[PDB]
Ligand binder design. Structure first.
Ligand code: NA
Ligand code: NA
Ligand code: NA
Ligand code: NA
Lengths: 132, 130, 133
DNA sequence: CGGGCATGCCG
DNA sequence: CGGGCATGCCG
């Protein structure tokens, strides 16, 4: 069953690697709760990872334990392992997204949380609420 | 829990793509109920697909409602989708395996079967029978 | 059923990537017909590829129409494609294996042959006669 | 498509 | 075990 009192996150991207952005929304109402403006170079998995950790921090700051939904098997695993295993080259052109990933990993390594991170079941429920 | 009153299918593959064979067994006895003679070139997933559909036909012909276990989540989806989304090249040397896939796909598009198709949970239960 | 009047090839490696060697033997008698001394760094699949192409050339110069057996379906396909699809980095340490693979591809791309390259069916026939152990 | 993943013979 | 080779959801 869908947990309606939850937050849903999703990446939007052009190419992969390419321009990436993400947002987090109320799973029921669609209210946009946070967003990340387009990053010129990134990968889908890096964006999905940042989006979950942003939701974790958003909810922690508000003393909320409600679940987060993502449709990214890879990003959910990366968050559980506290390590984003991206193959994207790290240089001056990718320094932005790599710094954001560094900071997300740092947050996960320095905080605990009860937030359930749940797989959105696209085949059953249709597109995730935060889809672009 | 393991539904013991079932069939289990397994595929044997010498490389991938490569020589492929399969069989269906009684989950509780290991009796071999049907088998496919080696196929010169196929993929593991095509073997698993064909093995499921063979078991579906075998069970329907016996008016059996036993489930089928497969270790292959991909082939289970293919059968539920009625379409084997294989990347194997269609040419003269793979004609046989693709012929067999097309016949199985035929059979799925004209029958609505009773058989539950279950994933064998090797990580908990050990190797699928044979 | 086995074509006993044939060549069988096999590869021995220590590590992967690692030290690679290979040999070709008379399937019927077990006699070593050719053997490649240790190559310091290569992959198993590159070694299996080189061994088949060595067999092709060995049979061609001996005016032989005998087939080759290999237990590597990967290397059989690579030979069929005339391309060894190895991921091994090209650098100074891998220069020798890559030179050999590049020369083997050149030979395949400039020569025709009728030699059947056949899959040795280990689980059904036992260990290939050229096995290292 | 690419990104990463799940899953499929040899040292 | 891990690594070289493969067959196979989401933007
Ligand atoms: Na997504
Ligand atoms: Na998502
Ligand atoms: Na396969
Ligand atoms: Na190899």
């Amino acid at each position: 069953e869908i947990i309606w009192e939850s937050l849903s996150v999703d990446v939007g991207s052009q190419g992969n690697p390419g321009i990436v952005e993400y947002k987090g929304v109320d799973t029921k109402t669609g209210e946009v709760l946070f967003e990340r403006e387009p990053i010129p170079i990134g990968t889908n998995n890096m964006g999905e990872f940042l989006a979950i950790v942003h939701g974790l921090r958003y909810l922690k700051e508000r003393n909320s334990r409600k679940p987060i939904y993502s449709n990214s098997q890879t990003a959910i695993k990366w968050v559980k392992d506290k390590k984003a295993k991206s193959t994207l080259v790290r240089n001056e052109e990718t320094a932005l997204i790599w710094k954001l990933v560094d900071e997300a990993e740092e947050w996960l390594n320095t905080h605990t949380y009860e937030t359930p991170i749940l797989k959105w079941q696209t085949d059953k429920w249709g597109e995730i609420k935060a889809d672009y």
